[PDB]
């Protein structure tokens, strides 16, 4: 009867999983670990709509909040995921206030936005739903370009979104650096600390994508509200590489 | 050109294999590209149906590993359809008798050596029109030893000509011996039974394999002379990796 | 060799089904009932493209006209559904004449629109096709916002569309009311009667989404050209609730 | 924590279950959230293959009902894969003999009580590491009685320890008795046979269930003391609901 | 209204059928709309699982041809599920004995003539409430002859009342006779065996069919009096068509 | 370790296949023939994202370059296909320089474009990837409208795209002619020869869709850099029609 991430915030940060691999079984198993949410990546993965739909059900059963990082900031895409029981939306490449308004417009019924009414899965979870519907959903605009960085105060002024979510590898690449996992490039570190500073100054939430528990520990200690660690494919490949090395030793 | 596990065996060396309980092509290619000689797809304990296994075999083959399937059951017609989909290794669960081992062998070879139906959709693309002459050599076939019955019938199972050897299911074997179904068990009777099966396989000039839950245990099985070592299931490795990332983050 | 809904109109209103549930078996069974068309909802459902494709085939075999209510008024989405054998398109959230022109542009080959030529399934049904292709397809713009209501005459002036299709729950919500199934909110009833009046005055068709046979009876008697009743999920849940009550009595 | 049908049975009360012939997760969750104790997915007469059943079981479990499967056939390895996918009830069609009932029982219990293969992917997530000790109790198993053969062999079918009891297939039973395959039949011989099967089940201290086409007929079966009543198939309820909406609209 | 192959047979004429090894609905409808009386979906040698066959049957029926399935195996419960999905013809591979032919026949007919389970989801939509009375006539059933065993047992296979006749698997038959598994073979012993099977089928008042790789070979089989001729697999026709387009382009 | 089509060009034209039918088996078999690339059509087919993903893997294994003709010139669609191992993109209905810039922006990382970084499948193929990533991908803008024809020099001036790809049936239809397969309509033939002339004058590649080996032979002899022949459905239907005619003779 509550968004698990919003419950954290009403008390603390949320730690979230991150899925690049389609399917229900790992999604349920990771949801039952000490993750507050699990994010399904529809941008940089083979996950289409038909594949994401049962994964959202698997995450909720595991007892974590089902989040989707979308392919694009498209209102109608975002609406169909909310009606399929995505209760968190991370939209990539939100570069301007107008783009942040487009995201906010998808997350709220009229009068606060233009979300189309047909809440197939949320009406089953919440039963009462319409009266609390905006609170059931967390919305974060991705900051991952020099343009998004310049427009940070503009983007954070948008009511309807909870805050921003840093894509550090795309931010590093767009600033002319190596697209390093958990990049500590001094200019990129500066930009990230600036985004976190401006989000907290406007009374908004800030999140960040991490490639490691180590990096995620530091981001939590830095006061980020929403930390993801680490992609299922990345954790699985590293574990298999270590299992093989130990076998062949 | 060649079955990469048989190439290992021919050059005097064991094969190390991955083990997939998670459906999908991306991790199947990613793990195939690691220093695994083969990758086994589990169709027994997992949600992987035939529709989901077919593209996974392609993805493993592209990554450079030999695609294997541990079937739901020792059923000839299920096995033949997987061979024709480009499964180049078959591991059949719960092979308890000489008769069941012969049923497996029958699926793996064309007439006159078995009764495999001819329609090799994917193997004819890989091997070309010369496929029939070398078909038997392109496929590796292992009967699973997971029961007291199979342990008692090991010598007669090992006498069947059309299987390469046996593959220990150590959690089922531990359970059927009255012990905890723990992977990589130290239980003396289970350890004894596993050593017994390897010794009998090697005495009969056949291959022996074993399912492992860890790199450390796989290292020992490789040093003991196991021909085909699997380590470790994608879901188990992923789950353990996530619990550690969470522990480090919190 | 004809659009079953257009045949009704050339003689009478069309009564249509409405699917929120993916799959072929219920789609064929409902198509064989006394429905002129069956609408597949790709907005407020788990139905992706791969799932809709075989449902269109199942509806045609049942002998009803296959319709799709799309996720969004996107030309290229609409074109791919027409080439998969959708012979009716209902586009949601058509708020302006420009948006109604975008819908019209997808439904017609040049010179009447810009529909891309590759009619995989219609060429199999019609064999002759190009010469009649516009007549094989029914197009309706959804009116479900106060903006769409204000622009009704603008939207109805667009050649290329057959008419409009009322979304009464979204219209009620956007006008500041409860999103009630078959809403009789006096302001919403007024707006709907106005839309029907203006559609018939411009010589265009008007349709309406209904949640019940009762409401659909009244809309047919009011002279609506295209009436849908009722969602498969809604009919199934209500039937199961009554079966359980009778079992437990 | 517990199988909701067994909890009903333990607290002295019958179970009412839904019946799905339509694949997909949305209606499966919607019906599971109604006052049904279980929801049965039909894999015999429907287009539901293994790939389509797997997410449906998840969706029923989330809705709060016990996920059941009426299998295509009484096949041990098919049954074991469904158990490992989180099917917590099994209804096996066309169980005609004590031997076939024993084949069903064998699939449902780990050694030493049956021969179920150990790899409980979804049950180990629900039940945790204590699963092995309580596995048998987490699963409900019913043998279907749908033939004159099964009716003649009812007492020997009911003597098998590893099944909870029987589930009447009344359209097949009516047909095999030489009568119209009508659901909720008034045909005196079919009615007699159904009462006979319930009385024998209850005399043997086993459960009895029946497939129903209507709420009214289900009410009577519940009053007659049936332990497990299904009412009614999603496609039948949907079809009847659409014909009435159409009738009212026109 | 009627099975289009049986309508051919009743009007004194053979049936020509297509043969699909490629999953999907678009080519299945496109080929069904050509001058084919039936289209066979191959579930033995192809990547077509149950989930992929179900919409293909719909697509063939819409195109105007009778939907047929060559099953993976002669398994009654697999056959019954395909009948209930709107497969109106069944071709069972590797039918070697009278007993196996009786197993096929049992799947195809309701009690009292066979043991087919009653739940005809798609046939009841096509045929209506009068389906039970005419069910047997709506389905065509052929046992495949592809082994020396089946050739020796042809007369006893042909004595089974509940199958329409036999369907030659000529590549498997050539292989089992010790010859190259070439389609449309000129090998004298294979040609002789094929003529022998047709003559025995026709002497027993049953139908005979044959799988062909070419239009030219199909023409000859039609002139020889084959009742059911398939020509030629979608993948083979597509592959040959692409090699010619490439040859012409380069 | 190279794009097979780019290798042709660095030496010769590329001949490519064209798939309208979903599935891996024909995709692998056609890839192993003497095709340099195989194009999967997501515009005029039942192929959704979940269906295209394994087909790309099947084509690469066969040893041809996996290409996709997209439903639409949508950056985020194009990015998700590149991260799934599409190494050629043909975007339909590219009518203006701005539209050609939108295509170019999807194909290149910053600073040359805005491609989002998460190369799941290319990182597995190339291992080194980022340093050569633009060279691994071929991009072609479709010319199939009178507007695209008028703007040809504009479109060809865009850096980031390799060239253009002619859709002759849509070009014929938009110019007021019959949408004939391999059309030789004199005005359409003129327009095509003009597009080829202007592409080669700007030092860019030109490709063309063919319905036959005969037409494709002539286009190769005319100096087209990228020739497709012929759709799998079209080749299969024609072969089946000839097999039936020979059987019934
Ligand atoms: Mg990013
Ligand atoms: Mg085992
Ligand atoms: Mg609406
Ligand atoms: Mg029955
Ligand atoms: Mg054969
Ligand atoms: Mg075009």
Numbering used by the authors:
A (entry chain B), C (entry chain B), F (entry chain B): 0 to 10, 12 to 127, 129 to 250
B (entry chain A), D (entry chain A), E (entry chain A): 0 to 249
Sentences from the paper on this structure:
Here structural analysis of hydroxyketoacid aldolase from Sphingomonas wittichii RW1 (SwHKA) revealed a dynamic movement of the metal cofactor between two coordination spheres without protein scaffold rearrangements. Holo‐SwHKA forms a trimer of homodimers, in which each monomer adopts an (α/β)8 triosephosphate isomerase (TIM) barrel fold. In total, holo‐SwHKA contains six equivalent active sites; each of which is formed from amino acids from two different domain‐swapped dimers. The transition from M2+ R to M2+ A,S is induced by bidentate substrate binding and occurs without a concomitant rearrangement of the protein scaffold.
To investigate a potential structural role for the metal cofactor in the M2+ R configuration through interactions with residue S116′, two different variants were designed at this position. Identical orientations of the alanine/serine residues were observed, and the protein fold was unaffected by the mutation (rmsd=0.115 Å between 230 Cα atoms). In the presence of ketoacids, bidentate substrate coordination affords M2+ A,S as the lowest energy complex and predominant state in crystal structures. For the S116A mutant, a lower apparent K d (i.e. higher affinity) toward M2+ A,S was observed with Mg2+, while the affinity remained mostly unaffected when Mn2+ was used. These data suggest that elimination of M2+ R could remove the competition between the two binding modes, and thereby increase its affinity toward the M2+ A,S configuration.
